[PDB]
Amino acid sequence: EQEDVLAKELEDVNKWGLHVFRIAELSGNRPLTVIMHTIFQERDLLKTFKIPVDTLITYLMTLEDHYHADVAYHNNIHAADVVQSTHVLLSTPALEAVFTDLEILAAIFASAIHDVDHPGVSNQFLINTNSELALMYNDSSVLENHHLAVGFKLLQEENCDIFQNLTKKQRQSLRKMVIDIVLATDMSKHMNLLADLKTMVETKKVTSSGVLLLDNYSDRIQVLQNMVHCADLSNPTKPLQLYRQWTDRIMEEFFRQGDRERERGMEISPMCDKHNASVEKSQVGFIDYIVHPLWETWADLVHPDAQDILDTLEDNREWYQSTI
């Protein structure tokens, strides 16, 4: 029974290193729909926010349909992966729960739409090719603004408004939080985001029970920004067999961008030249300069709830280094 094996894999929905590619395979290329549906049922969110299950499934299906099947990395599997990853980091003891049912709905919904309709090329490529997207969004977080616009737009399709029974004030607060979160997935925001995460760790305050003490929205949205950002950058922290599949996919997507750049005689973007790549050195550099500094700071913030995640990252870094 297909549906039995799928049901069994989804029993790991609360675990880092959730088996996501087989869930993709077993669900008929519907990992975003089935993982979101599971997390919503797991979190009682359909009953809390009076979401008709058919409206939930209708939207998730349409949303998943607007992820490109022919994009190697930024597709529905990556969205499902970021959703489930955010789902875990929300339930860390040092934060669980400290985010209301609305900001939890925000981080999850934002994770689900955060790359929707991704064309498989970078903001810089879109800027350099005088794309309609870069023309629309004035070269600023072009992809991320588009992801938001599509993710919200699809709510207006027939029987897709999963927020229909939220109050108008809940809809507004949720909308702002989702926008704030998704716009923060733009990698050009990473350094300022991490600096602000570091500042917060230095002035950190917690319960004796352990729960982190955040008072104002400015700090709570910033933890949710860095959380989804961490989930977006969580591939090198997953078990190696998952990590290596993500590396294959992102390198395939980079390489095809470099193919489009070479056809047009454009400068080939970093890591995008399949005739001049070092996949392994790139992963080590990626970990050393982006992923580990971010996850070391996040681990401090939720100390010690992220130790196993951080441990896996450092094991994977050591392994990739050893392939050089």
Ligand X SMILES: CCOc1cc(/C=C2\C(=O)Oc3cc(O)ccc32)ccc1OC
Binding site for ligand X (CB under 6 A): 185-187, 232, 235, 246-247, 250, 271, 282-283, 286, 290
Q: Among 244, 228, 253, which residue's Cα sits nearest to residue 283?
A: 244
Kindly tell me which of 92 and 185 has the beta carbon lying closer to Mg ion.
Answer: 185
Which of 145, 225, 234, 316 touches a second copy (CB under 8 A)? 145
Contact partner, 282, from ligand X, a second copy, Mg ion, none, Cβ < 5-8 Å per class: ligand X
Q: Which DSSP helix (H) or strand (E) runs through 174? A: helix 168-183
- Is the Cβ–Cβ distance between 240 and 272 less than 8 Å? no
Q: What is the gyration radius of the CA atoms in the chain, in angstroms? A: 19
Q: Minimum distance from CB of 124 to Mg ion (Å)?
A: 13
Kindly tell me which of 140 and 207 has the beta carbon lying closer to a second copy.
Answer: 140
Residue 186 binds Zn ion (CB under 5 A): no
Q: Minimum distance from CB of 158 to a second copy (Å)?
A: 17
Binding residues for Zn(2+): 78, 114-115, 232
Binding residues for Mn(2+): 115
Q: Provide the 10 A C-beta neighbour count for residue 26.
A: 21
Q: List beta partners, residue 212.
A: 206
Q: Among 240, 230, 226, 320, which residue's Cα sits nearest to residue 280?
A: 320
- Sequential DSSP letters for 131-145: -HHHHHHTTSSHHHH
Residue 136 binds a second copy (CB under 8 A): yes
Residue type, 275: H
287/190 Cα distance (integer angstroms): 14
Q: Among 78, 86, 71, which residue's Cα sits nearest to residue 122?
A: 71
Q: Which among 19, 37, 74, 292 is annotated as catalytic?
A: 74
Q: Considering only 16-24, 107-115, 137-145, 268-276, which stretch makes contact with Zn ion by CB under 5 A?
A: 107-115
Q: Considering only 5-13, 39-47, 112-120, 312-320, which stretch makes contact with Zn ion by CB under 5 A?
A: 112-120
Contact partner, 183, from ligand X, Mg ion, a second copy, none, Cβ < 5-8 Å per class: a second copy
99/221 Cα distance (integer angstroms): 9
- Is the Cβ–Cβ distance between 127 and 139 less than 8 Å? yes
Q: Minimum distance from CB of 203 to ligand X (Å)?
A: 27
Look up 74 and say whether it is catalytic: yes
Residue 244 binds a second copy (CB under 8 A): no
Which of 9, 115, 186, 253 touches Zn ion (CB under 5 A)? 115
Using CB under 5 A as the criterion, which residues of the chain lie in contact with Zn ion when the complex forms? 115, 232
